[PDB]
Design brief:
126 residues, 5-stranded antiparallel beta sheet, two-stranded antiparallel sheet, 7 strands, 22% strand, globular, viral protein
Amino acid sequence: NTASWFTALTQHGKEDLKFPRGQGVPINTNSSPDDQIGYYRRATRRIRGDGKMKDLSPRWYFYYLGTGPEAGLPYGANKDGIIWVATEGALNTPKDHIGTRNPANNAAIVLQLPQGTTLPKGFYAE
């Protein structure tokens, strides 16, 4: 069982997450500037109060390029529930040296965005 290195973003609006070009990569003091490139993947949740199934707010998790459930997708590839972010100067190389997080070893890093970053409407961290 693998996981994202960071906590999720919650979606309250009716559109997909989209960061302006050059923003969206969470801060990680253990990574290099060459690493600040990846994708958010959407995870959906449904529960059952007696109206059968109820759709909860979808969450978005960040994975470095070349890692995670879509490790094989190249940067920019079009797929539902996958959005791409990168900081300027980051290399378009797989980040296999960072990999994914094993929850049995490390807790998730609190997702913090760089200074002056704008989240889309309805999106909130934790």
